[PDB]
Design a protein around this nucleic acid. Sequence first.
RNA 1: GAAACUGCGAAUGGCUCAUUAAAUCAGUUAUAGUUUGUUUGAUGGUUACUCGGAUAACCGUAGUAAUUCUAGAGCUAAUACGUGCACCCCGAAAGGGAUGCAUUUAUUAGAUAGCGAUGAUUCAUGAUAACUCGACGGAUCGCACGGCCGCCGGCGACGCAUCAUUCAAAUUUCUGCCCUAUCAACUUUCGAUGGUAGGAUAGUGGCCUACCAUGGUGGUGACGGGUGACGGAGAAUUAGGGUUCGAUUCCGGAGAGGGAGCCUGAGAAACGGCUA
Lengths: 184, 200, 261, 147
Amino acid sequence: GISRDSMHKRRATGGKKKSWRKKRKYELGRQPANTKISSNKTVRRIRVRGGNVKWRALRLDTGNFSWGSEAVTRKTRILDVVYNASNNELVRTQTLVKSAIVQVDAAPFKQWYLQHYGIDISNHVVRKIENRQADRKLDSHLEEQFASGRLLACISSRPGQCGRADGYILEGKELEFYMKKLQK
Amino acid sequence: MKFNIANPTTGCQKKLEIDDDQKLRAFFDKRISQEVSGDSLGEEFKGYVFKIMGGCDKQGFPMKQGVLTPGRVRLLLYRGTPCFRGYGRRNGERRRKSVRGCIVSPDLSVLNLVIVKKGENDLPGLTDTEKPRMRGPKRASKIRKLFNLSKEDDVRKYVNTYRRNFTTKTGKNASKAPKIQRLVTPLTLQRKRARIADKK
Amino acid sequence: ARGLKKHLKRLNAPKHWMLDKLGGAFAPKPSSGPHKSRECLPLVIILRNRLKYALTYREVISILMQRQVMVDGKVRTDKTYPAGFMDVVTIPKTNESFRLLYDTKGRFRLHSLRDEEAKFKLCKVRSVQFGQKGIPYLNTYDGRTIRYPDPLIKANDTIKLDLDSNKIVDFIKFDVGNVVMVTGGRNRGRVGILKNREKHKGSFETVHIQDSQGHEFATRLGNVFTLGKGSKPWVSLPKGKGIKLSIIEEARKRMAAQSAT
Amino acid sequence: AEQTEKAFLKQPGVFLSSKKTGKGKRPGKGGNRYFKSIGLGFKTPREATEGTYIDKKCPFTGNVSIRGRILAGTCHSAKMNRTIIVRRNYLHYVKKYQRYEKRHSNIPAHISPCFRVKEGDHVTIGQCRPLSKTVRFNVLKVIPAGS
RNA sequence: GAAACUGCGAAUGGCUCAUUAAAUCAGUUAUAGUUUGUUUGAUGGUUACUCGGAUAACCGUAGUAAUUCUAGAGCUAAUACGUGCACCCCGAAAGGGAUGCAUUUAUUAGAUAGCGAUGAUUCAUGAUAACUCGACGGAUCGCACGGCCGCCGGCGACGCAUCAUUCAAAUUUCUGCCCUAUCAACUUUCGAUGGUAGGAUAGUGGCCUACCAUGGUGGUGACGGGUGACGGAGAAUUAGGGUUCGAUUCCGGAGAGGGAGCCUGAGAAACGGCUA
Ligand SMILES: [K+]
Ligand SMILES: [K+]
Ligand SMILES: [K+]
Ligand SMILES: [K+]
Ligand SMILES: [K+]
Ligand SMILES: [K+]
Ligand SMILES: [K+]
Ligand SMILES: [Mg+2]
Ligand SMILES: [Mg+2]
Ligand SMILES: [Mg+2]
Ligand SMILES: [Mg+2]
Ligand SMILES: [Mg+2]
Ligand SMILES: [Mg+2]
Ligand SMILES: [Mg+2]
Ligand SMILES: [Mg+2]
Ligand SMILES: [Mg+2]
Ligand SMILES: [Mg+2]
Ligand SMILES: [Mg+2]
Ligand SMILES: [Mg+2]
Ligand SMILES: [Mg+2]
Ligand SMILES: [Mg+2]
Ligand SMILES: [Mg+2]
Ligand SMILES: [Mg+2]
Ligand SMILES: [Mg+2]
Ligand SMILES: [Mg+2]
Ligand SMILES: [Mg+2]
Ligand SMILES: [Mg+2]
């Protein structure tokens, strides 16, 4: 099957390597997961070397995404893949891979923001909410996309390895870099 | 074509051989697990319903459920599944074997039938005498269920009901009873206390 | 190979076992255990080749299966159990108790011990690090793991372990001026005072050891085992006391022995 | 800027969108640029501590450790992107004739942007994990030719 | 105590030298680049007086010329199989949420010269926000019987998980190999050299994909060809230097008529395993 050996490769000088042994099981590869966005979740258990387990996600619809500046992590639905630095063909196929830029539902984060800052984007409770509002700052670019209900996010996990699609909300200059790529 | 007729309720079974093609027309084109009426199979079978469980072709190859063909095919089978016993073979070993399809056809050499509903007249040797079960329940829960026992009622006092007594050729008397499994005894409670004690 | 080798050819066995080359095609394959296969002495060798209690491979199994042999205070029934340096072997029926120490020629010697001295052993600390829940622990070169060690204990130190309480009684810091024994290499079995430590970043650390007679020899840090603080070891040493004599000196003693004996 | 690829390049573990300021914090914390000392007596170039380049293979600001053999040689080729060919010259002893013959070996090595190198310059390379099909070394110091 | 289920082993050993010329292999390195049944040491939170359904042996109807080829029916077990007692946030400070271990992501601490280690790691490890449709957290067995007035309790066996250790592997650094130039250029569309982002893998890596750059090797012999070429420890002969040999019992590698593919498993691209 798929092999990761260097025997089939040419030498650094360019000369060929004559085969001297058969393929080994300890240097094998496997078919790519090609995880897609779909409500029909499907993750298949794979038995790997040492009796360990790998989780290969074929279809995913929700992920655990973290808002770094606010230090809050919430489970949210994955809506669409918008950018992929490796191959643009992975965007129109809606493939979930690490470092892919996707849009996630903003509703879970809006609820926390209202519950935390008392703002939309009980005597002791109001005492602390106003206290936390003094040091409240929200990026204009980040706030602009809360109205549409979608947040640009980057996948930080490997769905074909761990079976999950987790990531973080884009912000700062990283958000500026990617939104410029999408401005056409 | 021969027929292996078995009566699950009575535990008896018998082999029937039929050569009349017109009588076999009822079974032809049928599949496994389907029910066939015995009215056309004969006069003594009036009111009987037979379920097709399987059979073997003239070459001895068995029929496999799900093979929607009348001929023979070669399949890669797993050990322990029907049509591949795989005794004395490596775990995870697969073998390619020939299996007849699940559709009944004149090419078959024998059919296994199960009586799902008896008719008017009881067949001889199939519904006349009931063969008792060789062994009684062995698990503690099953014994209580069999005799409708309660939590407080003892279970080991009822296993003697189906105790088997016999005489050996070299001896005169011998009785054997099963060992009750999953029976709560003082030793079992002691083990549980020790295991909890270790955690503390 | 497609996996693990279960056989040891006799010529491939460690030389310090002193196995006759024509005794057979195979040697006892050391089982996995606290000590490495190349730095151990299987119980079969000890009971049959060293102590002569057993005359054959079969008789060793009989002795061990009766639970008559203990290593580090615990009964061992494995014929190829890897007993190693500083291990205490006890045989209650014979009232004997030995400690595995290298003689000056680099071979394991069954040093008879008194009853009082057979209640502890020395272990070399491999490393100290935090475990799960932030609990510090240290592991030794004999496969032992001790939790909640003294904070002063560091890598390469020696700890006195009590075989009854299974706790660290005392420890010796690894520093120049202590008496140490060489546990590997050419100088295996030699005892001297650690005189210097030469560190080389990214490479092995060299240690200079001076014998009681002024002979100085070097070795790697991994082959050193501190025996005591100052100049007195905490364990009983064999007659040689780690003093390596020249072949000329050894021949001189042999000649004198014949004249007297 | 250093952002020239299709993806956004950044150091892993360095959060650039923190409300608090990184003033008074160690490298790699509070959004501060991350750098480290490789040991073995080698100095961290000022261009790596105060630079803005992103290189995960950099020995000082990347995710590669130096361990193994430290070698020296002369830069033979500097045409690849962040990779150079180091020529190592040595003498091979011919036993029968009790004499020597000049031999050489070309060792591919990764060079971080903090280093400036030209053909003929003397370089020191430290071993690291495989970075490519042929690269197993990272440039640690560059001495300009004629210096 | 036969049989049978379950467990484990059969990946060692033995045999051979066909392929293979910086490849194998040798000495010497690295894994801060990974997996590792077992051994050894340590470590696993503040219906339950014990659950459910199957199946073998057995029993009895059989088919086929035929095979540890095979179908149907009646029974009954488990350490088989499937289940199941088992500080932070919100907040009218009540109450509630989360709260074992493992998994995945993000934020944060890991100082200085309470606060561990390295030549060197945002390392060991801690805290926090969530996440997973988690083969995990004992429904097991032997012996001995005692101590309290139903309670409590001994010494073992087997098994699950984590770390370290041991037994090992994989990949890997530097140097080193016979004849041939009547072999001088070779490599790169379809990976050749390198870069970025991914995929795959136990894990590093053009190992593979997309995109980008135009590199990489060579009279210090690349590339190609020859070998009646497995490499080494070694063998013969040797004043010295040297010449020749090394299929074969030790070590390493490779193969099981030729290829390829694969299951099981801690470990095999296994062949006294399977598939073509
Ligand atoms: K191997
Ligand atoms: K096995
Ligand atoms: K080597
Ligand atoms: K060689
Ligand atoms: K890899
Ligand atoms: K690449
Ligand atoms: K196994
Ligand atoms: Mg039981
Ligand atoms: Mg072998
Ligand atoms: Mg080191
Ligand atoms: Mg069996
Ligand atoms: Mg050639
Ligand atoms: Mg080489
Ligand atoms: Mg960490
Ligand atoms: Mg990569
Ligand atoms: Mg490409
Ligand atoms: Mg040869
Ligand atoms: Mg040949
Ligand atoms: Mg040879
Ligand atoms: Mg030959
Ligand atoms: Mg032979
Ligand atoms: Mg061999
Ligand atoms: Mg093979
Ligand atoms: Mg042949
Ligand atoms: Mg094969
Ligand atoms: Mg054979
Ligand atoms: Mg074989």
